[PDB]
């Protein structure tokens, strides 16, 4: 379950704010994404995040 994976910033150096599902907190949180090599627990909005992972 990719929804349980920790957020992945990646090797690139942008500071792009994305969302990841935090199973411990039971909610989607923000984190800094570097701009490349995104894993699946990486969403552009909280709504996308909740729709895909909500309740995992």
Partner 1 sequence: IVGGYTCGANTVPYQVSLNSGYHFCGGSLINSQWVVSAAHCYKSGIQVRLGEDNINVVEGNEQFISASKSIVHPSYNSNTLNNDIMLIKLKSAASLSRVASISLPTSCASAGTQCLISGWGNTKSSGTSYPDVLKCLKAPILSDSSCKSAYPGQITSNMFCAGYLEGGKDSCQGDSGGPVVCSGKLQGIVSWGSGCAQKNKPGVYTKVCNYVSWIKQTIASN
**Footprint on this chain of partner 1 (rule: CB under 8 A):** 9, 11-17, 32, 34-37
As measured in angstroms, the least distance from the Cβ of 56 to partner 1 is 26
Nearer to partner 1, 3 or 16 (CB): 16
State which residue, 1 or 47, has the beta carbon closest to partner 1. Answer: 47
Inter-CA distances, 12 with 17, 19, 22, 37, 38, Å: 13, 17, 23, 8, 10
- If the CB atoms of residues 17 and 25 are measured against partner 1, the closer one turns out to be 17
CA distance 41 to 9: 11
């Amino acid at each position: 379950d990719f929804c349980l994976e920790p957020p992945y910033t990646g090797p690139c150096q942008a500071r792009i704010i994305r969302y990841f599902y935090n199973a411990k907190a039971g909610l989607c949180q923000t984190f800094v994404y570097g701009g490349c090599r995104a894993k699946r627990n990486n969403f552009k909005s909280a709504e996308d995040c909740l729709r895909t992972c909500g309740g995992a």
